């Protein structure tokens, strides 16, 4: 029969659910759009804009070779 | 409408409740008519707006246009698309017939008849009356010869069809001596569907095709009389099965073998399926680029007869297994292409050395070089060229398109043969709702060893 | 007879954790088609 | 074994959805009756053994029940002030939010 | 391309050939609708 | 129910929508964790410092071509905590750094182990026997073999599969390539497993669909069955008689039919995972030495097991250069084999 | 009581008590898998050389010239031949037959129709029996992967040499060229059988387990369940409602399948459709109609290209494509 919730047929066609749920998920989808346009995206976890996977002072692909010394590493080949 | 309440049939299975409702089963086949001749004239209207006219039409993702391009509408010399006129009049006038088909399909499943045997007795029936089921195959039949000879008419009085192997280059011809000889038209029907014969895909000029469509026409009109003025005979009522489902299962099977026929047709003819409208085909290609390089390598001054290749065989010309000279590398697999392009080159016993060494055109190398870059190889989202290539090239040719596309639907097509006249052979015989628990078959037969 | 149901359930949470941040990635990844390089 | 007035069904306004809901159909148990195909029936309805078992598959475990419904959640509390509210709220948010994405790009 | 005359009608065209697609999506609807019966 | 294990007890196994149990504090974490690893790493951490690449939605890269990128090979074997010893607790540069595979990667395998146990708590909740939890041991061996053990035997990680579609792709490329992998007796008992199943899976629904009984009047047969009833809705005498007369020989032992649908899959992936562990330490089946020695004594001898080698070369040749940056190949094109104008 | 000759032998025909059922379909099957066998038996024993991609060089495949099950294989037609009928009697001797791999065609052709006429007697002794005849149905997705493999694949790339060999290691050889000139892993039909694959393997697993899991009690500890069961018994041996119990607490209770009917179509249903989608991505890449190609996509603001995992995929497939067939190529393109 049933657990002891309210059936998922009920909640779905009620005027509260859909008055409630008409402003959060729009919010959202409107906060993962800002996310990712105001560049917060890119900061965050440090994915290279297109404009800056080559720098001028490297023009290859970047590799690391210290185990110890990745994180120096990792912050030398990031530099813009 | 109705519901499984009072039917037994689900709403997945919801057009079988109309199997004795001849009112709104012939209303929902109207409406079908319509909705194809609506897609007829939409994509007519869709290809037409997107035309350019410095690209050729297998370069566009054209597929309806070039079918309008081989009934010789606003096509030139050489291949070449003079007017667009036609096209969007044809495009016109379906889309306008649509909508009158469609209201009558509305009309005849909405406020009709529903069961038109009281009121219609003349378009009446019943599945089990075999004598009407075979007044109506008799005058679709009749319906389909006069189609047939439309179709001849159009080559022969109303300005013809386009020929590709026309001399001085294709261009639209009148066909004046269509071949109605028994012994050709036999020939192409009774033939291997192996390599070299061809079945009737190998079909090589336009003659046979309008002698063997007064054939099909004659035979059709007088197969739809003979079967209106008669009903099936004793072997025939002890063979078949007589209902609905075993007569929509027969044309299955009959138009999954159309398909079948259409999709290879497409993939390998050359002349219904001009290569100026639908590209090369497979063998087109490969020749095409054997024959671009051994005419670059001879300018180069070299001896393409005596030339020999890494494994012995010869760079450029070799022996078919029966004696032909043919083009040499992997395409030896392909010496049974004929275009319009390469047979001024080929003598009696295959090709001759002197014609490609002094008398090759400069418009059968163009030809050559087009059909060798526009090779019929692609990816699914529209990449050309091999599986190993870069994005760089925006074209799928239009032969692989249909012919992928119709063996998807014939074998879809067979499938759904197997499933009806299984159901309808079950059905008839009467335990397709399962086994009887009081009378079992098996319980009353000698175990096995 | 009446039926009064919680609205907060363990369900509630269940649906709620995959239901919340799929629709922020969703928004993200719509933003991210309008990205000219 | 299976009380078919007991399943919850007993809330459903269209007759046959709700005859559908619980296995049964009134036409089908008719010695004379005929489906589309022209096959007539042996008298055992949806289920032959509908009266040893109670009922069907169907009516052993629904997933439409209105009779479970909550009694509250067909009206709105708030009534009509809360919607003109909710209609105020969306159309703010709307505007702000296509404000928002309109200055953080490159127009 | 269209005539002349035609042109303004062009965005007309583009959209036609899935009217099909939206047939058979439009059965189905008319199914949920109907409640499935 | 008076102590804080009875009362926690009662509380956690609770008859719920959801059923949370004793093992669900192990599983629900950790599997949503790793979840939530996976979709972060495809949709907005990259590739381009570990491998040279792009993998994620940011980048431009479609569901097929986005992944959560393995290490790089100066790691090694490295757990790569978000605290230790190369993050130094940057979360930016971790990410940065490959730490998002191995953490989903350790999470997923504890989500594994609480999923089998919370197989054997709800079994022994309802009084049931826990073969459903012995049939996930298959599963969990094959990604214990492939995530783990091999990638322990190697290098280190950076030749771990990747969480991705073509990066899974490239992985069964790179095993064809080097490993010779199709010729692994171990991988052919997985394959004749995994295909047998399909096929007694679609025998056995086609089989007990087309054997049914008349319980009903209506065509549509699904509305003639009653879960609680006692009576079986097919014909085993019927489909055995079909059957013995078709193929030759026919079940007639139900059980004895479902032991076998659940053996046969299980032991198809455990022999291929035997096999995985096989080829952690490169002892692969890659040649036939007579073969071999003949084909170079006789110019003449030729099969199709010496074309896949060729194959096998060719693939390593061409893939190694970019594959494997760290080993910084540089390979002039004359090196390189090729075929005759290809 | 039948008196013709022709009445008797129909009756003897379509008789349910033979051992093996015999049919209208099994006097078309039965002869042409006879002869299939036989001369695949001989061919894979003691067959010589085959030439297979017409360049002069034989390919050898047979046990009694230096070969094992692993490697032994029966090479495809030669490429000289192309798609033309070579019947045994269209050869000038035998030793010349045996060089151009006639064998192949002939057990291509026999095998085909006897996977078909295997089908049809499939449906005959299914309506023979009483039954409903859709077990041939799911018998077409097998026989269509074998027909596209066999037949459909070597149509539409003009030669039976493309075709798949009858061996193991040939079988690998086949789906290497394959990968290398179609890109058949991103296709989305073969990812939508090998979806079909996998999930009948997991339904078939997840089906057994929970059968054997709600057995109900009828032996001791000293003999098996198997013992339990008796043949032609009226009464269901397991529980249903526990089994539907414990999925439903394992996942919720609307995942899992309350309807034994509905559940075994379910399984009927899934593999069948996979293999379906995966035979008709094969014949629809014969007419070269490859994968997706997503090879230089990722451009960076200046125009340089960002590589991917599509990308190291498209290297090993230049890696195997250029050695596929070292000295058959003689010009830059393989357009076939
Ligand atoms: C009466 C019952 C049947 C009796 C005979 C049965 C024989 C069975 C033998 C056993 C093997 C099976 C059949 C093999 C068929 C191979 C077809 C082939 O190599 O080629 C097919 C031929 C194409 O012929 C080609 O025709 C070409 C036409 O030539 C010319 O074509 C043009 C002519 O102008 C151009 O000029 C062109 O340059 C020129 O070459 C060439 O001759 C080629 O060499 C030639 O190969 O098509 C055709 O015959 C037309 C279409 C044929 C039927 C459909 C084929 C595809 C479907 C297969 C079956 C169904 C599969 C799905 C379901 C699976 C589950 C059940
Ligand atoms: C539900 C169980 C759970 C489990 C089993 C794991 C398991 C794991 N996590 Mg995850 N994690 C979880 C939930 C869980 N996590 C939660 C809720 C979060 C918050 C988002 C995280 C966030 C997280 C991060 C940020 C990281 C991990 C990582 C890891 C690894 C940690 C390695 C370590 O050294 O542990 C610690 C070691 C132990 C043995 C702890 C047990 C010690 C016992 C209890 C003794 C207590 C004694 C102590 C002296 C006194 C304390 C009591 C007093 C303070 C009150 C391991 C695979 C790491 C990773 O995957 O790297 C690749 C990592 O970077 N986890
Ligand atoms: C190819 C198109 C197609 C067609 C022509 C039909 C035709 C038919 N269906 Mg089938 N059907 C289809 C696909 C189709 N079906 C699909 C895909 C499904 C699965 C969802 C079904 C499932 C199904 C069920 C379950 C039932 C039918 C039934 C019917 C018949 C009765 C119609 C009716 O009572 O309700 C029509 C209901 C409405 C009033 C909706 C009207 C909407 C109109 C027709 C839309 C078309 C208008 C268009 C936009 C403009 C045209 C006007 C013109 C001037 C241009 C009708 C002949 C019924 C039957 O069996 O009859 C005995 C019924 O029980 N069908
Ligand atoms: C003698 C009277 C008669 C005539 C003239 C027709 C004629 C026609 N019927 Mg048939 N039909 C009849 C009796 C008749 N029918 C009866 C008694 C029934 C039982 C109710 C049917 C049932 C029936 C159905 C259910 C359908 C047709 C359709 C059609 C059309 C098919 C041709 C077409 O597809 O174009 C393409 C083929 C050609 C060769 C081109 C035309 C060339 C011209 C004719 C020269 C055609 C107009 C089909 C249709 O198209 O409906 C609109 C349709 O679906 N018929
Ligand atoms: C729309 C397609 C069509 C269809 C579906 C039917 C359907 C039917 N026909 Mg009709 N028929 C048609 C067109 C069609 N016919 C045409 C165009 C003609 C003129 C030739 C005839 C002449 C005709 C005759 C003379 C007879 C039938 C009969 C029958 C019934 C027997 C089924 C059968 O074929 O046995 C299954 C098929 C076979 C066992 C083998 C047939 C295959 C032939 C032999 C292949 C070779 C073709 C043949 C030699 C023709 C020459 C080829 C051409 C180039 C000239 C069935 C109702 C029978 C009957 O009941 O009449 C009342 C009958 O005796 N038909
Ligand atoms: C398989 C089982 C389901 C597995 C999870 C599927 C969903 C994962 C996330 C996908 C996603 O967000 O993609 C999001 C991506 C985003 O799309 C990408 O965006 C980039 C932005 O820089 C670029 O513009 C890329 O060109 C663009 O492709 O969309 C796609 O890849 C398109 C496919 C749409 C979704 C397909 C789902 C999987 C296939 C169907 C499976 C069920 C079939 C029944
Ligand atoms: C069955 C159920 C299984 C459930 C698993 C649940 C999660 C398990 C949690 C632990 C997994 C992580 C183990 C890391 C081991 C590791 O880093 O090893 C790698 C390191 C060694 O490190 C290596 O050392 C080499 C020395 O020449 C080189 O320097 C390498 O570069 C370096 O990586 O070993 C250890 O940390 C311990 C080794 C001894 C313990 C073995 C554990 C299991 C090994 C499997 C077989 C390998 C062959
Ligand atoms: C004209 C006919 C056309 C088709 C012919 C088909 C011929 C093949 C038949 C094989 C039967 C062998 C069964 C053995 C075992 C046996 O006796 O089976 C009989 C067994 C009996 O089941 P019961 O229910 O009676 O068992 C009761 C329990 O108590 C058992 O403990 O039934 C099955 O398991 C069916 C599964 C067969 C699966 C066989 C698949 C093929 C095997 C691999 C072939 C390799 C070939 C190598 C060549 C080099
Ligand atoms: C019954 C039924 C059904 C079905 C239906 C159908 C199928 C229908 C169809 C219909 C149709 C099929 C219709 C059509 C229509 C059409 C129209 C309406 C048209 C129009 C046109 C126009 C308007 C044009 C115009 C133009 C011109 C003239 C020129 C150029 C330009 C243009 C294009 C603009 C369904 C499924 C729902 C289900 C239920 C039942
Ligand atoms: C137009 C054209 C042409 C012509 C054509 C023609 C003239 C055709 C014809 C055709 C035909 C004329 C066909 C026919 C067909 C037939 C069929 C396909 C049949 C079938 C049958 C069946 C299937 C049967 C079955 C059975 C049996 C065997 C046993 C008992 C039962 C039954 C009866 C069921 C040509 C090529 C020159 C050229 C191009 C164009
Ligand atoms: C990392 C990390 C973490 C975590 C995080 C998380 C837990 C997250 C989550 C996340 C999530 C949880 C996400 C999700 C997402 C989702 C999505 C993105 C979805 C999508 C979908 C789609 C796209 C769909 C599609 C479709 C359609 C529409 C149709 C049909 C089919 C399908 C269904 C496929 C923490 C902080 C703790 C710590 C550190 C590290
Ligand atoms: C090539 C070797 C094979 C031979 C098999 C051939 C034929 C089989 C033998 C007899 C055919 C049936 C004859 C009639 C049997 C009795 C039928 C009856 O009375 O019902
Ligand atoms: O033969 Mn088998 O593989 Ca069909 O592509 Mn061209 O040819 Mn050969 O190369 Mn690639
Ligand atoms: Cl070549
Ligand atoms: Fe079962």
Redesign the pocket.
């Given at each position: 029969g049933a657990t002891g919730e309210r059936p998922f047929s009920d909640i779905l066609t009620s005027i509260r659910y859909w008055v409630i749920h008409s402003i959060t998920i729009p919010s959202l989808f409107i906060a993962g759009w800002l996310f990712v346009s105001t560049g917060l995206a890119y900061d965050v976890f440090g994915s290279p804009r297109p404009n800056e996977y080559f720098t001028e002072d490297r023009q290859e692909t970047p590799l690391i070779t210290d185990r110890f010394n990745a994180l120096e590493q990792v912050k030398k080949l990031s530099e813009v | 409408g109705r519901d499984q309440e009072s039917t037994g049939f689900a709403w997945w299975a919801g057009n079988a409740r109309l199997i004795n409702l001849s009112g709104k089963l012939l209303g929902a086949h109207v409406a079908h008519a319509g909705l194809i001749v609506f897609w007829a004239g939409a994509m007519n209207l869709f290809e037409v707006a997107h035309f350019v006219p410095e690209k050729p039409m297998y370069e566009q993702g054209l597929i309806l246009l070039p079918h309008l391009a081989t009934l010789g509408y606003g096509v030139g010399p050489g291949g070449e698309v003079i007017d667009t006129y036609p096209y969007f009049v044809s495009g016109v006038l379906h889309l306008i017939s649509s909508a009158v088909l469609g209201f009558g399909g509305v009309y005849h499943s909405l406020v009709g008849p529903e069961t038109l045997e009281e009121s219609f007795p003349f378009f009446g029936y019943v599945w089990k009356d075999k004598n009407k089921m075979t007044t109506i195959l008799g005058i679709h039949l009749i319906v389909l010869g006069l189609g047939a000879w439309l179709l001849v008419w159009k080559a022969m009085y109303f300005g013809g069809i386009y020929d590709t192997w026309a001399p001085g280059g294709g261009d639209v011809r009148i066909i004046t001596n269509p071949t109605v000889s028994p012994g050709v038209?036999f020939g192409?029907?009774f033939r291997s569907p192996f390599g070299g014969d061809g079945w009737?895909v190998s079909?090589d000029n336009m003659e046979?095709?309008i002698?063997?469509?007064i054939?099909?026409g004659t035979?059709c009109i007088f197969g739809g009389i003979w079967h209106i003025l008669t009903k099936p005979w004793a072997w025939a009522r002890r063979?078949?099965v007589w209902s609905g489902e075993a007569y929509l299962s027969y044309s299955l099977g009959a138009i999954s073998?159309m398909g079948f026929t259409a999709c290879c047709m497409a993939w390998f003819n050359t002349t219904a399926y001009p290569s100026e409208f639908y590209g090369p085909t497979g063998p087109e290609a490969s020749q095409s680029q054997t024959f671009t390089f051994l005419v670059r390598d001879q300018r180069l001054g070299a001896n393409v007869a005596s030339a020999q290749g890494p494994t012995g065989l010869g760079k450029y010309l070799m022996r078919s297994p029966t004696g032909e000279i043919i083009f040499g590398g992997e395409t030896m697999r392909f010496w049974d292409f004929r275009g319009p392009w390469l047979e001024p080159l080929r003598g009696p016993n295959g090709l001759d050395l002197n014609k490609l060494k002094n008398d090759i055109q400069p418009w059968q190398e163009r030809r050559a070089a087009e059909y060798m870059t526009h090779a019929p190889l692609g990816s699914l989202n529209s990449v050309g060229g091999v599986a190993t290539e870069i994005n760089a090239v925006n074209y799928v040719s239009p032969r692989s398109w249909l012919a992928t596309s119709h063996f998807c639907l014939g074998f879809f097509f067979f499938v759904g043969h197997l499933w009806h006249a299984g159901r309808a052979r079950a059905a008839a015989a009467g335990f397709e709702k399962g086994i009887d628990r009081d009378n079992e078959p098996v319980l009353s037969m000698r175990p096995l060893d | 007879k009446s039926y009064t149901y919680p609205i907060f359930t363990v369900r509630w949470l269940a649906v709620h954790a995959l239901a919340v941040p799929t629709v922020f990635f969703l928004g993200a990844i719509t933003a991210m088609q309008f990205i000219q390089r | 074994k299976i009380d078919i007035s007991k399943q919850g069904l007993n809330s459903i306004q269209n007759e046959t959805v709700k005859l559908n809901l619980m296995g049964k159909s009134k036409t089908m148990e008719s010695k004379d009756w005929v489906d589309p195909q022209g096959r007539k029936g042996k008298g055992y309805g949806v289920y032959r053994f509908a009266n040893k078992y109670g009922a069907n598959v169907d009516g052993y475990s629904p997933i439409y029940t209105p009779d479970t419904w909550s009694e509250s959640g067909d009206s709105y509390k708030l009534g009509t002030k809360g919607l003109i509210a909710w209609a105020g709220l969306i159309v703010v948010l709307l505007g702000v939010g296509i404000n928002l994405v309109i200055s953080t790009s490159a127009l | 391309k269209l005539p002349e005359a035609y042109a303004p009608f062009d965005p007309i065209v583009d959209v036609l050939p899935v009217i099909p697609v939206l047939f058979l999506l439009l059965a189905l609807v008319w199914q949920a609708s109907v409640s499935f019966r | 129910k008076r102590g804080w294990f009875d009362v926690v007890d009662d509380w956690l196994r609770r008859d719920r929508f959801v059923f949370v149990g004793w093992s669900g504090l192990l599983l629900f974490p950790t599997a949503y964790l790793a979840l939530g690893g996976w979709f972060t790493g495809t949709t907005f951490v990259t590739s381009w410092y570990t491998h040279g690449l792009a993998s994620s939605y940011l980048e431009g890269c479609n569901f097929l071509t986005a992944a959560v990128s393995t290490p790089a090979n100066s790691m090694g074997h490295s757990l790569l905590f978000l605290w230790g010893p190369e993050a130094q607790g940057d979360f930016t540069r971790w990410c940065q750094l490959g730490g998002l595979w191995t953490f989903v990667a350790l999470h997923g395998s504890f989500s594994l182990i609480g999923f089998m146990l919370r197989q054997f708590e709800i079994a022994r909740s309802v009084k049931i026997r826990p073969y459903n939890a012995i049939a996930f041991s298959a599963p969990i061996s094959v990604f214990v073999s492939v995530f783990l053990i091999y990638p322990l035997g190697q290098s280190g990680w950076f030749f771990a599969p990747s969480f991705g579609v073509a990066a899974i792709f490239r992985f069964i490329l790179f095993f064809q390539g080097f490993h010779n992998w199709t010729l692994n007796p171990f991988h052919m008992m997985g394959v004749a497993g995994v295909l047998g199943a399909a096929l007694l899976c679609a025998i056995h629904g086609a089989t007990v669909e087309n054997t049914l009984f008349e319980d009903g009047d209506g065509a549509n047969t699904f509305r003639a069955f009653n879960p609680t009833q006692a009576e079986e809705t097919y014909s085993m005498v019927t489909a055995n008689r079909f059957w013995s007369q078709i193929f030759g020989v026919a079940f007639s032992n139900k059980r004895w039919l479902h032991f076998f649908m659940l053996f046969v899959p299980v032991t198809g992936l455990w022999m291929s995972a035997i096999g995985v562990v096989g080829l952690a330490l490169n002892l692969r089946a890659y040649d036939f030495v007579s073969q071999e020695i003949r084909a170079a004594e006789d110019p003449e001898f030729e099969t199709f097991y010496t074309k896949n080698i060729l194959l096998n070369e060719g693939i390593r040749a061409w893939m190694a250069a970019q594959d494997q940056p760290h080993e910084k190949l540089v390979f002039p094109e004359e090196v390189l084999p090729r075929g005759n104008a290809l | 009581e039948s008196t013709s000759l022709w009445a008797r032998f129909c009756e003897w025909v379509t008789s349910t008590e033979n051992r093996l059922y015999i049919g209208w379909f099994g006097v078309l099957m039965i002869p042409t898998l006879l002869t299939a066998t036989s001369v695949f038996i001989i061919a894979f024993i003691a067959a010589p050389p085959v030439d297979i991609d017409g360049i002069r060089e034989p390919v050898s495949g047979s046990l009694l010239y230096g070969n094992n099950i692993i490697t032994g294989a029966i090479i495809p037609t030669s490429n000289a031949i192309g798609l033309h009928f070579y019947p045994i009697w269209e050869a000038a001797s035998l030793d010349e037959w045996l060089y151009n791999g006639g064998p192949y065609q002939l057990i291509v052709c026999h095998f085909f129709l006897g996977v078909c006429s295997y089908m049809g007697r499939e449906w005959e002794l299914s309506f023979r029996l009483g039954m409903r005849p859709w077990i041939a149905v799911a018998y077409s997705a097998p026989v269509a992967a074998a027909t596209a493999v066999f037949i459909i694949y070597p149509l539409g790339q003009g030669s039976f040499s493309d075709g798949m060999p009858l061996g193991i290691s040939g079988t690998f050889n086949f789906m290497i060229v394959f990968q290398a000139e179609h890109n058949i892993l991103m296709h989305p039909f073969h990812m939508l059988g090998v979806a079909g694959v996998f999930g009948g393997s997991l339904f078939s697993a997840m089906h057994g387990s929970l059968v054997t899991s709600s057995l109900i009690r009828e032996t001791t500890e000293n003999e098996s369940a198997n013992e339990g069961y008796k043949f032609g018994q009226e009464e269901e041996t397991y529980n249903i409602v526990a089994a539907h119990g414990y999925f439903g607490r394992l996942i919720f209770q609307y995942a899992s399948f309350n309807n034994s009917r509905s559940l075994h179509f379910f399984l009927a249903a899934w593999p069948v459709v996979g293999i379906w989608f995966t035979a008709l991505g094969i014949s629809t890449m014969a007419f070269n109609l490859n994968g997706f190609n997503f090879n230089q996509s990722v451009v960076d603001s200046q125009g340089r290209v960002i590589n991917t995992w599509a990308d190291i995929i498209n290297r090993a497939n230049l890696g195997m494509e250029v050695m596929h067939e070292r000295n058959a190529h003689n010009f830059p393109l393989d357009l076939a």
């Open positions: - | 038209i192409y029907l009737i079909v046979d095709v002698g063997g469509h054939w099909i035979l063979a078949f073998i | - | - | - | - | -």
